[PDB]
């Protein structure tokens, strides 16, 4: 999606920011980096009904409490959103830093500290949004993919069915819950040098188990590109998180099961995208088997010490 | 193509610029918008042997003479280029402004003034680069596309052959020549408001007829999206150009033929790209017939007055 010069200039009169000097499309949503006579900005077109108030309101709340995350800029007319070339649109503050292509264990510690800080900061935010991608959503995604799963790997259907049944039967209820990011991968965390400078992209955020968000980050940050679990990174992540918000015995004990769950979650969306991408295109599509391999690894874990924490 | 944080930081120690605070992939070549503690910058990875010295050297020369175009930043080691993740790489100054999605005739006048200023400023630059996409290149492109041209439109082969033969037989020799941009479309010109703020992307630049560069801009700026020639824009463009560098009688007289030539040039690259893009992909490909239609229109022109200049 593109925007014209006059439309964007009109859009910016709804906000109190510099005058436009530059705008560039940058690498769901369309995003533009704006330069102005004041500060740079991010423009987001939502390529898209109470979810945006949740996401943008959460971002405000967290920023108001000191978290380094992007702040939605306020509109003159008091509305939450504008509109640009058909789509809902928001101006958002610009955070410095870059996401790490080759994170090291010391960075994972910063990530754990920041995730805990985010969990603590999210207290008092009262708009609710259930996780659309927990157990019930896994069942929907699987149901839609089940008959063609064996195209990805022979035996895949019979491997997954018992596991989804099991996770659903045992999914924990009585663990600390709050607002979680639910998608905190490498590309959603900024650093300036080795200091973490921000958390971005809260569009999967929702109310769910805090230790489930930890399990997403274990899956996201603590495995090597060849699939090897990296205990040095797992230790860093978990100790970093504990340094800010200690995990209970019940939370630590649940991590292997929760990590199977989050691994399955990414397996399932990747599987659905893989089966559903048109026959013969040149998007190279994410391999769902990466997350099946992570899921199997988590089944081997008898104690959180094995993730690196003890 | 992507770059890692450490590679880019090392790359920037070869230059005298701020420290890196941010980098973003932006919408041949891969381009990144860098923020630093000093000025913003553009990083270009050439997705690629004397052409870069020509292009980057031209950019330097023009900037040194006042033209608003991007300046290649100088390397500590005196070399012209660096290397990043396999590719040749250059840091380039950042120009403010945005390219016009909906240019009006008054903007076309600014474009004409700037093209003339560029032609005048390019005097004294002595590296030579022949146009690879003049008559000889048209013959190569056509030869490679000729047998499948009728797939785009019935009769296309027999329409083009006489025209390419004719242009080749009559292509003008004795018109003013110098360095031309050779690709000055809407997306290669920046404005801040209604003031033109820069010319960018000189990677088709070459030594050729100055009025041939004017004919590219007539083709690029002076037709509506429905194909209609816009005499108001043509007048603006040509009068703007004349206000800085008057065109001779011989140049004005040649414009219809030159415009057939430049129209054919874009027809041919578009045709080759169209035939050569894999069967069943979802890049929507540029229609070569747009430029066949422009070519036919130029055949109807008996006098430059009809483009709008008189
Ligand atoms: Mg380091
Ligand atoms: Mg205006």
Coordinates of C-alpha atoms and ligand atoms in Angstrom, one line a residue:
Chain A
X1 CA 0.0 0.0 0.0
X2 CA 1.2 3.5 -0.8
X3 CA 0.1 7.0 0.2
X4 CA 0.0 10.4 -1.6
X5 CA 1.8 13.5 -0.4
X6 CA -1.4 15.6 0.1
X7 CA -3.2 12.8 1.9
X8 CA -0.3 12.3 4.3
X9 CA 0.0 16.1 4.9
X10 CA -3.7 16.3 5.7
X11 CA -3.4 13.3 8.0
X12 CA -0.6 15.0 10.0
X13 CA -2.8 18.1 10.7
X14 CA -4.8 15.8 12.9
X15 CA -1.7 15.4 15.1
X16 CA 0.8 17.8 16.7
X17 CA 4.1 16.8 15.1
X18 CA 6.6 18.5 12.8
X19 CA 5.9 19.3 9.2
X20 CA 6.6 16.4 6.8
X21 CA 10.1 16.4 5.2
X22 CA 10.4 12.8 4.1
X23 CA 8.5 9.5 4.0
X24 CA 9.7 6.0 3.1
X25 CA 8.0 2.6 3.0
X26 CA 9.9 0.3 5.3
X27 CA 10.3 -3.5 5.6
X28 CA -0.8 -7.3 9.4
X29 CA 0.5 -3.8 8.3
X30 CA 2.1 -1.3 6.1
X31 CA 4.7 0.9 7.7
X32 CA 6.3 4.2 6.8
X33 CA 9.2 6.1 8.4
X34 CA 8.5 9.8 8.4
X35 CA 11.0 12.6 9.0
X36 CA 9.6 15.9 10.2
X37 CA 10.9 19.3 11.3
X38 CA 10.5 17.9 14.8
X39 CA 11.0 14.2 15.5
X40 CA 10.8 11.2 13.2
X41 CA 7.7 9.1 13.3
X42 CA 6.2 5.8 12.3
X43 CA 3.0 5.6 10.3
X44 CA 1.1 2.3 10.4
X45 CA -1.7 1.4 8.0
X46 CA -3.6 -1.6 9.5
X47 CA -4.2 -4.0 6.6
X48 CA -7.0 -5.2 8.7
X49 CA -13.0 -4.2 16.0
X50 CA -11.9 -3.7 19.7
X51 CA -8.4 -5.0 19.1
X52 CA -6.8 -1.7 18.1
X53 CA -8.1 0.1 21.3
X54 CA -6.6 -2.8 23.2
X55 CA -3.2 -2.7 21.4
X56 CA -2.8 1.1 21.2
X57 CA -4.2 1.6 24.7
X58 CA -1.7 -1.0 26.0
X59 CA 1.2 0.8 24.3
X60 CA 0.1 4.1 26.0
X61 CA -0.3 2.5 29.4
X62 CA 3.2 0.8 29.3
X63 CA 4.9 4.0 28.0
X64 CA 3.1 6.0 30.7
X65 CA 4.7 3.6 33.2
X66 CA 8.3 4.0 31.9
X67 CA 8.5 1.0 29.5
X68 CA 10.5 1.8 26.4
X69 CA 7.9 1.0 23.7
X70 CA 6.3 3.1 21.0
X71 CA 3.7 5.7 22.0
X72 CA 0.6 6.3 19.8
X73 CA 0.5 10.1 19.2
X74 CA -2.7 11.8 20.4
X75 CA -5.3 13.1 17.8
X76 CA -6.7 16.6 17.9
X77 CA -10.2 15.2 17.6
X78 CA -9.7 12.8 20.5
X79 CA -10.3 9.7 18.4
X80 CA -7.8 6.8 18.6
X81 CA -7.4 6.3 14.9
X82 CA -7.4 8.1 11.6
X83 CA -7.9 6.7 8.2
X84 CA -5.6 6.8 5.2
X85 CA -6.2 5.3 1.7
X86 CA -9.0 3.1 3.0
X87 CA -7.2 1.6 6.0
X88 CA -7.2 2.5 9.7
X89 CA -4.1 4.5 10.4
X90 CA -2.0 5.6 13.5
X91 CA 1.0 7.8 14.1
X92 CA 3.4 6.2 16.5
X93 CA 6.6 7.5 18.2
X94 CA 10.0 6.5 16.8
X95 CA 12.2 4.3 18.9
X96 CA 16.0 4.2 18.3
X97 CA 17.9 1.0 18.0
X98 CA 18.0 -2.1 15.8
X99 CA 16.9 -5.7 16.1
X100 CA 19.7 -8.2 16.5
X101 CA 20.4 -10.6 13.7
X102 CA 23.0 -12.5 15.8
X103 CA 21.9 -12.1 19.5
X104 CA 24.3 -13.5 22.1
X105 CA 23.4 -14.9 25.5
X106 CA 24.0 -11.5 27.2
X107 CA 21.3 -10.0 25.0
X108 CA 18.9 -12.8 26.0
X109 CA 19.4 -11.6 29.6
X110 CA 18.3 -8.1 28.7
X111 CA 15.3 -9.6 26.9
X112 CA 14.2 -11.6 30.0
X113 CA 14.6 -8.4 32.2
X114 CA 12.5 -6.4 29.7
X115 CA 9.7 -9.1 29.4
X116 CA 9.4 -9.2 33.2
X117 CA 9.3 -5.4 33.4
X118 CA 6.6 -5.4 30.7
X119 CA 4.5 -7.9 32.6
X120 CA 4.8 -5.8 35.8
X121 CA 4.1 -2.6 34.0
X122 CA 0.9 -4.0 32.4
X123 CA -0.8 -4.2 35.8
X124 CA -3.7 -1.8 36.0
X125 CA -4.5 -1.8 32.3
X126 CA -8.1 -2.9 32.2
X127 CA -9.1 -3.4 28.6
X128 CA -9.3 -7.2 28.1
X129 CA -8.4 -9.2 25.0
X130 CA -8.4 -13.0 25.2
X131 CA -5.6 -14.9 23.4
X132 CA -7.0 -15.9 20.0
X133 CA -4.0 -18.2 19.6
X134 CA -4.1 -20.4 22.8
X135 CA -5.8 -23.8 23.0
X136 CA -9.1 -23.0 21.2
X137 CA -7.3 -21.3 18.4
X138 CA -4.9 -24.2 18.0
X139 CA -7.8 -26.5 17.6
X140 CA -9.3 -24.3 14.8
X141 CA -6.0 -24.0 13.0
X142 CA -5.3 -27.8 13.3
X143 CA -8.9 -28.7 12.2
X144 CA -8.4 -26.6 9.0
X145 CA -4.9 -28.2 8.3
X146 CA -5.3 -31.8 9.5
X147 CA -6.2 -33.4 6.3
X148 CA -3.2 -32.0 4.3
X149 CA -0.6 -32.1 7.1
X150 CA 1.1 -35.3 5.7
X151 CA 2.1 -33.1 2.6
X152 CA 4.7 -31.4 4.9
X153 CA 5.9 -34.7 6.5
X154 CA 4.7 -38.3 6.4
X155 CA 3.1 -39.2 9.8
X156 CA 2.6 -35.6 10.8
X157 CA -1.1 -35.9 11.4
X158 CA -0.7 -38.9 13.8
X159 CA 2.1 -37.2 15.6
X160 CA 0.2 -33.9 16.3
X161 CA -3.3 -35.3 17.2
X162 CA -2.2 -36.9 20.5
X163 CA -0.1 -33.9 21.4
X164 CA -2.9 -31.3 20.8
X165 CA -5.3 -33.5 22.8
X166 CA -2.9 -33.8 25.6
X167 CA -2.0 -30.1 25.8
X168 CA -5.7 -29.2 25.7
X169 CA -6.5 -31.7 28.5
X170 CA -3.6 -30.4 30.7
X171 CA -3.3 -26.7 29.8
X172 CA -2.7 -24.9 33.2
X173 CA -5.3 -22.6 34.7
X174 CA -3.9 -21.5 38.0
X175 CA -0.7 -19.7 37.1
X176 CA -0.2 -15.9 37.2
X177 CA -1.9 -14.2 34.4
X178 CA -1.7 -10.6 33.1
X179 CA -1.0 -8.9 29.7
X180 CA 1.6 -10.7 27.6
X181 CA 3.3 -9.7 24.4
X182 CA 2.8 -13.1 22.8
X183 CA 5.2 -12.5 19.9
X184 CA 8.5 -11.3 21.3
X185 CA 10.9 -12.6 18.7
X186 CA 14.3 -11.1 17.8
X187 CA 12.8 -8.7 15.3
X188 CA 10.5 -7.1 17.9
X189 CA 13.2 -6.0 20.3
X190 CA 15.5 -3.0 19.7
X191 CA 19.1 -2.6 21.1
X192 CA 21.5 0.3 21.0
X193 CA 24.7 -1.6 21.3
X194 CA 24.3 -4.2 24.0
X195 CA 21.6 -2.2 25.9
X196 CA 18.0 -3.1 25.1
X197 CA 16.3 0.1 23.8
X198 CA 12.7 -1.0 23.2
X199 CA 9.9 -3.5 22.8
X200 CA 7.8 -3.1 19.6
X201 CA 4.8 -4.7 17.8
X202 CA 2.2 -5.5 20.4
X203 CA -0.4 -6.7 17.9
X204 CA -0.6 -10.2 19.3
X205 CA -0.8 -8.9 22.9
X206 CA -3.5 -10.4 25.1
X207 CA -4.4 -11.5 28.6
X208 CA -2.8 -14.9 29.3
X209 CA -0.3 -16.7 31.6
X210 CA 2.9 -14.8 32.1
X211 CA 5.0 -18.0 32.1
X212 CA 3.4 -18.8 28.7
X213 CA 5.0 -15.5 27.4
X214 CA 8.3 -16.7 28.9
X215 CA 7.9 -20.0 26.9
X216 CA 7.4 -18.0 23.7
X217 CA 10.8 -16.2 24.3
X218 CA 12.5 -19.5 25.2
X219 CA 11.3 -20.8 21.8
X220 CA 12.2 -17.6 20.0
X221 CA 15.6 -16.7 21.5
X222 CA 17.2 -19.9 22.9
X223 CA 17.6 -22.2 20.0
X224 CA 20.4 -22.0 17.4
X225 CA 19.7 -21.8 13.6
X226 CA 20.7 -25.5 13.3
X227 CA 18.0 -26.4 15.9
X228 CA 20.3 -26.9 18.9
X229 CA 18.9 -25.7 22.2
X230 CA 21.3 -23.2 23.7
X231 CA 21.4 -23.6 27.5
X232 CA 23.6 -20.5 27.9
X233 CA 20.9 -18.4 26.3
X234 CA 18.1 -20.1 28.2
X235 CA 20.0 -19.5 31.5
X236 CA 20.5 -15.8 30.6
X237 CA 16.9 -15.3 29.6
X238 CA 15.4 -17.0 32.7
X239 CA 17.9 -15.4 35.2
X240 CA 17.3 -12.0 33.5
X241 CA 13.5 -12.5 33.9
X242 CA 13.9 -13.7 37.6
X243 CA 16.0 -10.7 38.5
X244 CA 12.9 -8.5 37.9
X245 CA 9.9 -10.8 38.5
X246 CA 10.7 -14.1 40.3
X247 CA 8.9 -17.1 38.8
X248 CA 7.1 -19.3 41.3
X249 CA 7.8 -23.0 41.7
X250 CA 4.5 -23.7 39.9
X251 CA 5.5 -21.5 37.0
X252 CA 9.0 -23.1 36.6
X253 CA 7.5 -26.5 36.8
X254 CA 5.0 -25.6 34.0
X255 CA 7.6 -24.3 31.6
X256 CA 8.2 -27.5 29.6
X257 CA 4.4 -28.0 29.0
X258 CA 3.9 -24.3 28.2
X259 CA 6.8 -24.4 25.8
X260 CA 5.3 -27.4 24.0
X261 CA 2.1 -25.3 23.7
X262 CA 3.9 -22.2 22.3
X263 CA 6.0 -24.4 20.0
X264 CA 2.7 -25.9 18.7
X265 CA 1.2 -22.5 18.2
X266 CA 4.0 -21.4 15.8
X267 CA 3.9 -24.9 14.2
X268 CA 0.2 -24.5 13.5
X269 CA 0.3 -20.9 12.0
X270 CA 3.3 -21.9 9.9
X271 CA 1.5 -25.1 8.8
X272 CA -1.6 -23.2 7.8
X273 CA 0.4 -20.6 5.9
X274 CA 2.4 -23.3 4.2
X275 CA -0.6 -25.3 3.0
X276 CA -2.5 -22.1 2.0
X277 CA 0.2 -20.3 0.0
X278 CA -0.7 -20.6 -3.8
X279 CA 0.8 -23.6 -5.7
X280 CA 3.9 -22.1 -7.4
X281 CA 4.9 -18.8 -5.9
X282 CA 8.4 -17.4 -5.0
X283 CA 7.8 -16.5 -1.4
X284 CA 10.0 -19.0 0.4
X285 CA 7.7 -20.0 3.3
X286 CA 8.6 -20.7 6.9
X287 CA 9.2 -24.4 7.7
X288 CA 6.7 -25.6 10.2
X289 CA 9.0 -28.5 11.0
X290 CA 11.4 -26.1 12.9
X291 CA 8.7 -25.8 15.6
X292 CA 7.8 -29.5 15.6
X293 CA 11.5 -30.1 16.4
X294 CA 11.3 -27.5 19.2
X295 CA 8.1 -29.2 20.5
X296 CA 9.8 -32.6 20.7
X297 CA 12.8 -31.1 22.5
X298 CA 10.5 -29.7 25.2
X299 CA 9.0 -33.1 25.9
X300 CA 12.5 -34.3 26.9
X301 CA 12.8 -31.7 29.7
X302 CA 12.2 -33.0 33.2
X303 CA 13.3 -30.0 35.1
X304 CA 13.8 -26.3 34.5
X305 CA 17.4 -26.8 35.5
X306 CA 17.8 -28.3 32.0
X307 CA 16.8 -25.1 30.3
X308 CA 19.7 -23.6 32.2
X309 CA 18.2 -22.2 35.4
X310 CA 19.8 -23.6 38.5
Chain B
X1 CA 19.3 -8.7 1.3
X2 CA 19.9 -8.0 5.0
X3 CA 22.9 -6.8 7.0
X4 CA 23.9 -7.6 10.6
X5 CA 24.5 -4.9 13.3
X6 CA 28.3 -5.7 13.7
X7 CA 29.0 -5.7 10.0
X8 CA 27.2 -2.3 9.5
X9 CA 29.0 -0.8 12.5
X10 CA 32.4 -2.0 11.1
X11 CA 31.4 -0.6 7.7
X12 CA 30.7 2.8 9.2
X13 CA 34.2 3.1 10.7
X14 CA 35.4 3.4 7.1
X15 CA 33.5 6.7 6.9
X16 CA 33.3 9.9 9.0
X17 CA 29.6 9.9 10.0
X18 CA 27.7 9.7 13.3
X19 CA 27.4 6.5 15.3
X20 CA 24.6 4.2 14.2
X21 CA 21.3 4.6 16.1
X22 CA 18.9 2.9 13.6
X23 CA 18.6 1.2 10.3
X24 CA 15.6 0.1 8.2
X25 CA 15.3 -1.6 4.8
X26 CA 13.4 0.8 2.6
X27 CA 11.2 0.3 -0.6
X28 CA 19.5 -3.0 -9.2
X29 CA 19.8 -2.4 -5.4
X30 CA 19.1 -2.9 -1.7
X31 CA 18.7 0.3 0.2
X32 CA 18.7 1.2 3.9
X33 CA 17.9 4.4 5.7
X34 CA 20.3 4.9 8.6
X35 CA 19.9 7.2 11.5
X36 CA 23.1 8.3 13.3
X37 CA 24.1 10.7 16.1
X38 CA 24.9 13.2 13.3
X39 CA 22.9 13.1 10.0
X40 CA 20.8 10.4 8.4
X41 CA 22.3 8.4 5.6
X42 CA 21.4 6.0 2.8
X43 CA 23.3 2.7 2.5
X44 CA 23.1 1.1 -1.0
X45 CA 24.1 -2.5 -1.7
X46 CA 24.6 -2.9 -5.4
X47 CA 22.9 -6.3 -6.3
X48 CA 25.3 -6.1 -9.2
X49 CA 33.0 -2.8 -13.7
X50 CA 33.6 0.9 -14.4
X51 CA 30.0 1.9 -14.1
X52 CA 30.0 2.6 -10.4
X53 CA 33.0 5.0 -10.7
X54 CA 31.0 6.7 -13.4
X55 CA 27.7 6.9 -11.5
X56 CA 29.2 7.8 -8.1
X57 CA 31.8 10.2 -9.6
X58 CA 29.0 11.9 -11.6
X59 CA 27.0 12.3 -8.4
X60 CA 30.1 13.9 -6.7
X61 CA 30.7 16.3 -9.6
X62 CA 27.1 17.5 -9.8
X63 CA 26.9 18.0 -6.0
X64 CA 30.2 19.9 -6.1
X65 CA 28.6 22.2 -8.7
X66 CA 25.5 23.0 -6.6
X67 CA 23.0 20.4 -8.0
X68 CA 20.8 19.0 -5.3
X69 CA 21.6 15.3 -5.6
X70 CA 22.9 12.7 -3.2
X71 CA 26.7 12.8 -2.4
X72 CA 28.7 9.6 -2.0
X73 CA 30.4 9.9 1.4
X74 CA 34.3 9.7 1.2
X75 CA 36.1 6.6 2.6
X76 CA 39.0 6.8 5.0
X77 CA 41.0 4.4 2.7
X78 CA 40.4 6.6 -0.4
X79 CA 38.6 3.7 -2.2
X80 CA 35.3 4.5 -3.9
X81 CA 33.4 1.5 -2.5
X82 CA 33.2 -0.8 0.4
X83 CA 31.8 -4.3 0.6
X84 CA 28.9 -5.6 2.8
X85 CA 27.5 -9.1 2.9
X86 CA 29.1 -10.0 -0.5
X87 CA 27.9 -6.9 -2.4
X88 CA 29.6 -3.6 -3.4
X89 CA 28.4 -1.0 -0.9
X90 CA 28.3 2.8 -0.7
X91 CA 27.1 5.4 1.9
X92 CA 25.3 8.3 0.4
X93 CA 24.0 11.6 1.8
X94 CA 20.3 11.8 2.6
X95 CA 18.1 14.2 0.6
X96 CA 14.9 15.6 2.1
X97 CA 11.6 15.5 0.2
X98 CA 9.3 13.0 -1.3
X99 CA 8.5 11.9 -4.8
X100 CA 5.1 13.0 -6.2
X101 CA 2.3 10.5 -6.7
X102 CA 0.1 13.1 -8.3
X103 CA 2.3 15.7 -10.0
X104 CA 0.7 18.7 -11.5
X105 CA 1.9 20.8 -14.4
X106 CA 3.6 23.3 -12.1
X107 CA 5.8 20.5 -10.8
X108 CA 6.7 19.4 -14.4
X109 CA 8.1 23.0 -14.9
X110 CA 10.4 22.4 -11.9
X111 CA 11.4 19.1 -13.4
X112 CA 12.3 20.7 -16.7
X113 CA 14.4 23.4 -15.0
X114 CA 16.2 20.8 -12.9
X115 CA 17.0 18.5 -15.9
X116 CA 18.5 21.5 -17.8
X117 CA 20.5 22.5 -14.7
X118 CA 21.8 18.9 -14.5
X119 CA 22.8 18.9 -18.1
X120 CA 24.7 22.2 -17.7
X121 CA 26.3 21.1 -14.4
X122 CA 27.5 17.8 -16.0
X123 CA 29.9 19.7 -18.2
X124 CA 33.5 19.1 -17.2
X125 CA 32.9 15.5 -16.0
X126 CA 35.2 13.4 -18.0
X127 CA 34.5 9.7 -17.2
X128 CA 32.6 8.3 -20.2
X129 CA 29.8 5.8 -20.2
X130 CA 28.0 5.0 -23.5
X131 CA 24.3 4.5 -23.3
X132 CA 23.7 0.7 -23.1
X133 CA 20.0 1.4 -23.9
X134 CA 20.1 3.4 -27.1
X135 CA 19.8 2.0 -30.6
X136 CA 22.2 -1.0 -30.3
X137 CA 20.7 -2.1 -27.0
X138 CA 17.2 -1.8 -28.5
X139 CA 18.2 -4.2 -31.2
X140 CA 19.6 -6.7 -28.7
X141 CA 16.5 -6.5 -26.5
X142 CA 14.2 -6.9 -29.5
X143 CA 16.1 -9.8 -31.0
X144 CA 15.7 -11.6 -27.7
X145 CA 11.9 -10.9 -27.5
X146 CA 10.8 -10.9 -31.1
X147 CA 9.7 -14.5 -31.4
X148 CA 7.3 -14.3 -28.4
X149 CA 6.1 -10.6 -28.8
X150 CA 2.7 -11.7 -30.2
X151 CA 1.9 -13.3 -26.8
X152 CA 1.5 -9.6 -25.5
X153 CA -0.5 -8.5 -28.5
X154 CA -1.4 -10.0 -31.8
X155 CA 0.5 -8.3 -34.6
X156 CA 3.1 -6.7 -32.2
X157 CA 6.1 -8.2 -34.0
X158 CA 5.1 -6.7 -37.4
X159 CA 4.3 -3.4 -35.8
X160 CA 7.7 -3.0 -34.1
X161 CA 10.1 -4.3 -36.8
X162 CA 9.5 -1.5 -39.2
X163 CA 9.7 1.1 -36.4
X164 CA 13.0 -0.2 -34.9
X165 CA 14.5 -0.3 -38.5
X166 CA 13.4 3.3 -39.1
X167 CA 14.6 4.7 -35.8
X168 CA 18.0 3.0 -36.3
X169 CA 18.3 4.4 -39.8
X170 CA 17.4 7.9 -38.8
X171 CA 18.7 8.2 -35.2
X172 CA 20.2 11.8 -34.9
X173 CA 24.0 12.2 -34.6
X174 CA 24.5 16.0 -34.6
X175 CA 22.5 17.2 -31.6
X176 CA 24.1 18.5 -28.4
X177 CA 25.4 15.6 -26.2
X178 CA 26.6 15.5 -22.6
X179 CA 25.8 13.5 -19.5
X180 CA 22.1 12.6 -19.2
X181 CA 20.1 11.0 -16.4
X182 CA 18.3 8.6 -18.7
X183 CA 15.7 7.5 -16.1
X184 CA 14.1 10.7 -14.6
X185 CA 10.7 9.3 -13.7
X186 CA 8.4 10.7 -11.0
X187 CA 9.9 8.4 -8.4
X188 CA 13.5 9.8 -9.0
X189 CA 12.6 13.4 -8.2
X190 CA 12.1 14.8 -4.6
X191 CA 10.0 17.8 -3.7
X192 CA 9.5 19.6 -0.4
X193 CA 6.0 21.1 -1.0
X194 CA 6.0 22.5 -4.6
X195 CA 9.8 23.1 -4.6
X196 CA 11.9 20.5 -6.2
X197 CA 14.4 19.4 -3.6
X198 CA 16.5 16.8 -5.4
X199 CA 17.3 14.4 -8.3
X200 CA 18.2 10.8 -7.3
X201 CA 19.2 7.4 -8.8
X202 CA 21.7 8.1 -11.5
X203 CA 22.3 4.4 -12.3
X204 CA 21.2 4.7 -15.9
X205 CA 23.2 7.9 -16.5
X206 CA 25.4 8.0 -19.6
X207 CA 26.7 10.2 -22.4
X208 CA 24.0 10.8 -24.9
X209 CA 21.9 13.5 -26.6
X210 CA 20.5 16.0 -24.2
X211 CA 17.2 16.3 -26.1
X212 CA 16.9 12.5 -25.8
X213 CA 16.8 12.9 -22.0
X214 CA 14.1 15.6 -22.5
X215 CA 12.1 13.0 -24.5
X216 CA 12.4 10.5 -21.6
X217 CA 10.8 13.1 -19.3
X218 CA 8.1 13.9 -21.8
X219 CA 7.2 10.2 -21.8
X220 CA 7.6 9.9 -18.0
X221 CA 5.8 13.1 -16.8
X222 CA 3.4 14.3 -19.5
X223 CA 0.9 11.5 -20.1
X224 CA -2.1 10.8 -17.8
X225 CA -2.7 7.4 -16.2
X226 CA -5.4 6.7 -18.8
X227 CA -2.8 7.3 -21.6
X228 CA -4.0 10.8 -22.6
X229 CA -1.1 13.2 -23.5
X230 CA -1.3 16.3 -21.3
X231 CA -0.3 19.4 -23.2
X232 CA -0.4 21.5 -20.1
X233 CA 2.3 19.3 -18.5
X234 CA 4.3 19.2 -21.8
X235 CA 4.3 23.0 -22.0
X236 CA 5.4 23.3 -18.4
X237 CA 8.2 20.8 -18.8
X238 CA 9.6 22.3 -22.0
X239 CA 9.2 25.9 -21.0
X240 CA 10.9 25.0 -17.6
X241 CA 13.8 23.4 -19.4
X242 CA 14.1 26.3 -21.9
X243 CA 14.2 28.8 -19.1
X244 CA 17.6 27.4 -18.1
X245 CA 19.0 25.8 -21.3
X246 CA 17.4 26.9 -24.5
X247 CA 16.8 24.0 -27.0
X248 CA 17.9 24.7 -30.6
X249 CA 15.6 24.5 -33.5
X250 CA 17.3 21.2 -34.5
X251 CA 16.6 19.8 -31.0
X252 CA 13.0 20.8 -30.9
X253 CA 12.5 19.5 -34.4
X254 CA 14.0 16.1 -33.3
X255 CA 11.8 15.7 -30.2
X256 CA 9.0 13.6 -31.9
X257 CA 11.6 11.1 -33.3
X258 CA 13.6 11.0 -30.0
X259 CA 10.3 10.5 -28.1
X260 CA 9.5 7.5 -30.3
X261 CA 13.0 6.2 -29.5
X262 CA 12.6 6.6 -25.7
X263 CA 9.1 5.2 -25.8
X264 CA 10.5 2.1 -27.6
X265 CA 13.3 1.8 -25.0
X266 CA 10.8 1.4 -22.2
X267 CA 8.5 -0.8 -24.3
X268 CA 11.5 -3.1 -24.9
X269 CA 12.7 -3.5 -21.3
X270 CA 9.1 -4.0 -20.2
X271 CA 8.5 -6.5 -23.0
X272 CA 11.6 -8.5 -22.0
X273 CA 10.7 -8.4 -18.3
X274 CA 7.2 -9.5 -19.2
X275 CA 8.2 -12.5 -21.3
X276 CA 10.9 -13.5 -18.9
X277 CA 9.0 -13.4 -15.6
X278 CA 8.3 -17.0 -14.5
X279 CA 4.9 -18.6 -15.6
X280 CA 2.6 -18.1 -12.6
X281 CA 4.0 -15.6 -10.1
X282 CA 2.3 -12.7 -8.2
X283 CA 4.4 -9.8 -9.2
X284 CA 2.0 -7.8 -11.4
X285 CA 4.3 -6.8 -14.3
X286 CA 4.4 -3.5 -16.1
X287 CA 2.4 -3.4 -19.3
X288 CA 4.7 -2.9 -22.3
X289 CA 1.6 -1.7 -24.3
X290 CA 1.5 1.6 -22.3
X291 CA 4.7 2.6 -24.1
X292 CA 3.6 1.2 -27.5
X293 CA 0.7 3.6 -27.1
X294 CA 3.0 6.5 -26.3
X295 CA 5.2 5.6 -29.3
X296 CA 2.2 5.7 -31.7
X297 CA 1.1 9.1 -30.2
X298 CA 4.6 10.6 -31.0
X299 CA 4.3 9.5 -34.6
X300 CA 1.3 11.9 -34.9
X301 CA 3.3 14.9 -33.8
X302 CA 4.3 17.3 -36.7
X303 CA 5.6 20.1 -34.6
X304 CA 6.9 20.7 -31.1
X305 CA 4.0 23.3 -30.7
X306 CA 1.8 20.2 -30.3
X307 CA 3.7 19.1 -27.3
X308 CA 2.7 22.4 -25.8
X309 CA 5.6 24.7 -26.6
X310 CA 4.7 27.8 -28.6
Ligands
LIG1 MG1 29.5 -6.9 21.4
LIG2 MG1 -0.4 22.3 -3.9

